[PDB]
Structure formats: C-alpha cells, structure tokens
Amino acid sequence: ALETVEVMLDWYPNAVHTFLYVAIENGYFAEEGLDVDIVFPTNPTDPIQLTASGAIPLALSYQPDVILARSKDLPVVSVASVVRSPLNHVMFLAEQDFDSPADLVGLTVGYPGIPVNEPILKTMVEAAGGDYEQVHLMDVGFELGASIVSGRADAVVGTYINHEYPVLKHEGHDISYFNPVDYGVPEYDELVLISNEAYVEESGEVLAAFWRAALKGYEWMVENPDEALNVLLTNQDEANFPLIQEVEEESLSILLEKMENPNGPFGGQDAESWEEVISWLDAHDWLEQPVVAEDAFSSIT
Amino acid sequence: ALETVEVMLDWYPNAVHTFLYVAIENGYFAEEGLDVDIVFPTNPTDPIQLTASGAIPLALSYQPDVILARSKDLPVVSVASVVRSPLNHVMFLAEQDFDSPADLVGLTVGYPGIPVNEPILKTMVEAAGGDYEQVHLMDVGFELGASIVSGRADAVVGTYINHEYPVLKHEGHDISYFNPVDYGVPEYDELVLISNEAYVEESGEVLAAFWRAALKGYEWMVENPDEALNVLLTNQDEANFPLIQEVEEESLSILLEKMENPNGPFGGQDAESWEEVISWLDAHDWLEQPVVAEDAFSSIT
Ligand SMILES: Cc1ncc(CNC=O)c(N)n1
Ligand SMILES: Cc1ncc(CNC=O)c(N)n1
C-alpha cells in the first residue's frame, strides 16, 4: 500500500538534512502515501553510483559531480537544487600558513574520495600558478578532520565552512582556509537531489509526491527554524557523527540563506548555473563525453 | 636506455615493501635494464583500478580482489604471490568486549573502501550467526586506526595484524580482534603483485627482468633483515605515514614467515589457492561473471 522510497543522504546527518527529517516526523510522506527510507552511504561516492546503477531512486549529491557522472555516461539526473552555492573549502591548520593554493604543490591533500574534489582543487591550484600534477590527494573517506589534525595530510578539501570548519574550531583546532570561488571555481550548487533517468520516466508520480512532501518539510523548517533544528538533532547519528548544538544552529543559519530560492520555490533549478558549471568543467578537460544542461537536470514538479 | 616502469604500492610505505626499495637502492632494477618509479595510491582501490585500465603496468593488491576484479570483467592478472596468507584482522578497542563477529550487528565497522573487505566481514558475521544486512560499513580510506580510536567506528576491518595491530598497541590502545580464518574465510594470499593481460603479453621480458631484480632484492633482505629494514625506513613516507622502528621490525618478523615459499621460489603461485578462493566467493554469491583460476594468475619467469 505504502510506496517505499530509499533516500541516500550525501553524508552523515547534519543541519543541511533538516528539511528531510521534518518531512518524516510530520508525516508529510505518510500523507503522500510514501514510506521514505533514509539511508547513509558506506562510501562517500555511493550516492551517485547507487542512484546511477538504479539500486536507489533518490540521493543527495553535488552538481559538478552529476556532470562528471553524466559525462562518463551515467544516467544520473538532478531533480532539485538544495544548496544553491558552494560550501566546500580547502582547510588546514593555521601553523601551515600557506599563502595560496599553489603552496599545496608537493604536499598531500586529504579528501573524501568524491571526484568533484579533483576539478575544484585542480582549478584552485592552477589559478595560483602551481602544478597540480605534483599535488597529492589522499583518500580519507569520512575522516576529513582527522586527516588534517593527525598530520598525515597537509590540508583537506571536501570540508564545509558550515560544518567541518566550525567543528574543528569548537574542538580547539586553529583552522585557516582557501575559498574555491576566490580561485576560478564557479558558484556551483553544493548539493542537489538526484535520481536516475528511468525512475524519472517510469515513476514520475512517486517523485512528485516525494518533493511535494519534502517541500512542506522545507517550508515548515523555514517557519519553525529552531523546532525543526531540534528534530534533526534528536535524529542525529550520535554513534558515528555526533553533532554539537551550537555548531549546528550556526550551520543552519548559513544554509538557510544558501538553500532559499530568491525567485522561485525551494528546489527550483536555474539553467544558467548548470550551463556554466558544465562549460567550466568542459573547459578544463574534465568531461570525456559531452554533457548538456537540458539533460543534466529536470523538474519533478 | 633504462626501461621506465610504474609500480603502484597497495598502501603507503611499510615493512612489507622492503624487498622493493632494496631492489631499487641496491641497483638491481637498473641491472635488469629498468627504471622503477614507485608511486603511492591516492585511493585504496587505485592499484586494481589503474592497473586494469592500463594506466599502470604493475601494482600490489589482494588475491580475492583480483578475482572480484575479473568477476567484473577487469583484465587484471596476478603475476606473483608476495604474502601467501592473510594479514587482515577485524579490530576493535578491548572495551567493546565482543564475543563474536555477530556482535557487530547494529554497529558500524570502518574499512579502507577496498571491496575485498565486504566478502570477508559478511562471511565472518554470518558464520557467527548474525545478519550482515544489519552491519554498517564506514569508508575511512587510509584513516583506519582513527575510525576506532575516535570511537567514530565500533570496529574496523582492513587493518593488518603485522602493522595496525602493533601500532595501535604501541600508541597505547588495548586491541582485541577476530581472525577471518577462524570464521569461515579461506587462507587467501594477502598481497600479490598484479599486472594487466595486455602488458603481460606485450612486455613479458620486462616483467621477467623486473621480477629477477625483485627476487634478488627479496633474497638480499632475507640475508640482511635489519640492513634491509633500514633501507625501507630511510625510504619511508614520513610526512603522510611515519613508521616506528620497533613496530616495523616486528612487522617484518611476521611477513618474513608469510612471504617465504617453504618449497619453491618467492612469488610462486598455484591453481589450488586460487580455486579455493574463487569457490569461496561464488558460494557466498560475490561473483558476477564466473572466474577461471588459470586465467587469474600466471608465472612471470
Ligand atoms: C558535512 C559534509 N562534509 C563533506 C561532504 C563531502 N562533499 C564533497 O566532498 C558532505 N557531503 N557533507
Ligand atoms: C598496512 C596496510 N593496512 C591496510 C591495507 C589494506 N588492505 C585491505 O583492505 C594494506 N594494503 N596495508
């Protein structure tokens, strides 16, 4: 009777996922006859791979990644834009005192294994005249903070200003960073709801029912900021990704601004954003097969 | 002219790679007309993946992985067994007090992101009477120790008894474990030298040149345990994977036993081991395409 839908988040639960949990808790999905199954990823890259393979119909990923994916012939399609601008920043301990991304040359940068991180770091490094081919990336999965703090990596990319940054500071670490948009990286959407082609064609109803629900979750979160932030926190995976309340409210405050759609409903996708993100990548030889903005995303409403 | 050959290590430099750095320092590779360039993986799955694609001609991986890779149609082939038995142990802080792998049900286990670990853990958990679907894997790439020491993970797999075990202990952690061999897993070769089919066909004289120099380095190590281990430590990656004199010589003591072919030459393989490991993976439904032991490995000399 209830349509069961698997939704794989992009990371372990945190402020950015608030709208989804509010949807669950308020029965918005039940009202829509859906049984939403929120799932965490085993590997950071699972979201796009599983969605692509058709194993799961929904997940949260990164716009630049969707393009990378579609460029490799994966049938991944963005059906909604959650965070309309970047969150990703390159981080390191203040003692490192790097002058610019070009100082990463000859050093090792930790990262979650997520591909999107390659074009971002490459652009940032070349933008400063360094030779990215001498920059060493070290996959640390979810252990982003530990890579930098332990010392095994000189810097990290994949960390968010709305999260990892305030957490490290809260934990006492003195963190400095480089903002990708100050080094040739476009204002891409950090996070987008993604599905696969078949499911968009074969199950448009379910997808429409889902977003309608998720949107109510969003609108409710917006009108009930604190209350909704409380919902997430209680639903946090305390065993593997414990959250700090103060850190999370600050995170939410940042995300709210970036999640809101100035000239349309929450989730509305801007064709301009995609077009330039594709050309940015296509320009740096990251796209093996051509990608078109009319195919990288579609409206499920 | 020296024949350039890229060799990707399975992990960062440690006791197990001593025979290779010895063959470089002592000039054995040069003697065989080759210029060997050791490269570290940025991603734990790189070895198998870059070899398969032809991007790299040589690398170190795991016997079960070669099978899985071939099961996925990748053209990789094992050209030498380096560590003839398992090293992989599931590890957790002594606090946990698990009675068996079935206690892992409902918890999260960290792993390097290397596929071979899924079949291992699943077999283990199932042998102890637990539901694996209820076990959560968390990708931490190279940050294995951190996953459990930070409490972010309840247990970890992928860690080696010759390295991580003595390291955690040396760092002050009371570690407990579960040997996969005690829980239905076969005595597979932990480390094996790999190449792709195309290369073994086109560059066999190179491979043979490379392996003689390698055998020579290996034999020197056996006659000069300590001098070799020092060659290794001086050639360690101190910035991203610092080593401890004591743990590393302890590690060598373990590997010396597992690397030696009691009767036969170093690197020698045989259908038996491969067929056993293949059958294991088929029985537990891990293979997609059937795999043939014969095609899975081949002598290099
Ligand atoms: C809180 C947080 N941190 C890092 C990531 C990883 N994204 C790109 O590398 C993510 N999805 N969420
Ligand atoms: C020292 C060490 N630790 C872990 C691994 C990873 N193997 C399987 O996951 C490895 N190749 N070497």
CB–CB contact B139 A241 (8 Å): no
Tokens describing residue B80: 């030498």
Domain match, A194 and A295 both = yes
3-state secondary structure of A19: helix
Q: Does residue A11's CB lie within 6 angstroms of at least one atom of ligand 1? A: yes
Residue at which a domain ends, from A170, A188, A206: A188
Structural domain count, chain B:
2
Q: Which two tokens stand for residue A201?
A: 């064609």
Judge if A79 and A193 occupy the same domain: yes
Shared domain for A105 and A224, answered yes or no, is no
The dihedral through the CA atoms of B58, B64, B66, B68 has a sign that is negative
Task: Write the DSSP assignment of B159-174 as a string of letters.
Answer: -BTTTHHHHHHHTT--
Q: Are residues B36 and B132 in the same domain?
A: no
Which of A11, A142, A163, A188 has most ligand 1 atoms within 8 Å of CB, for mutation?
Answer: A11
Regarding whether B130 and B74 lie in a shared domain, the answer is no
A195 and A263, same domain (yes or no): yes
B71 shares its domain with B138: no
Q: B114 CB less than 6 Å from ligand 2?
A: yes
| Residue where a domain terminates, one of B165, B188, B211 | B188
Stated as kind and residue range, the H or E segment containing B272 is helix B271-283
Of A183, A185, A159, A181, nearest in space to A103 by CA: A183
Residue located via tokens 């899985």: B68
* Same domain, residue pair A117 and A54: no
* Same domain for A160 and A48: no
Experimental method: X-ray
Total residues belonging to chain B: 301
**Residues B228, B22 contacting (CB under 8 angstroms):** yes
Asked if residue B56 and residue B203 are part of one domain, the reply reads yes
Q: Does residue B11 line the site of ligand 2, with CB under 6 A? A: yes
How far, in Å, CA of B270 to CA of B296, rounded? 10
Pocket test for ligand 2, best of B48, B160, B241 (most atoms within 8 A of CB): B160
Both B202 and B65 in one domain: the answer is yes
Query: How many angstroms is the resolution?
Result: 2.4
CATH code at position B159? 3.40.190.10
Q: Which residues of B182-211 are buried (b: 16+ CB within 10 A; e: fewer)?
A: ebbbbebbbbbbbbbbebbeebeebbebbb
State which H helix or E strand residue B63 sits in: helix B63-71
**Which numbered atom of ligand 2 lies nearest the CA of B191?**
11
Q: Describe the crossing of helices B225-234 and B204-223 by its angle, rounded to 10 degrees.
A: 120
- Phi, psi values for residue B156, rounded to 5°: -145, 145
Domain, as residue range, for B104: 86-188
Three-state SS for B81?
Answer: strand
Centroid of ligand 2 to alpha carbon of B118 (angstroms): 14
Question: How remote is the CA of residue B11 from the centroid of ligand 2, in Å?
Answer: 6
Which of A43, A143, A240 is closest, CB to CB, to B146?
Answer: A143
Last residue of a domain, one of B143, B172, B188: B188
Q: Ligand 2 centre from B159 Cα, in Å?
A: 6
Strands in B136-139's sheet, in edge-to-edge order, are B136-139, B108-111, B155-156, B90-93, B175-178
**What are the beta bridge partners of residue B93?**
B175
Judgement on whether residues B90 and B179 belong to the same structural domain of the protein: yes
User: What single DSSP character describes residue A211?
Assistant: H
Q: Could you tell me which residues of chain B have a Cβ less than 8 Å from any Cβ in chain A?
A: 40, 42-44, 107-108, 113, 136-143, 146-147, 150, 152-154, 239-241
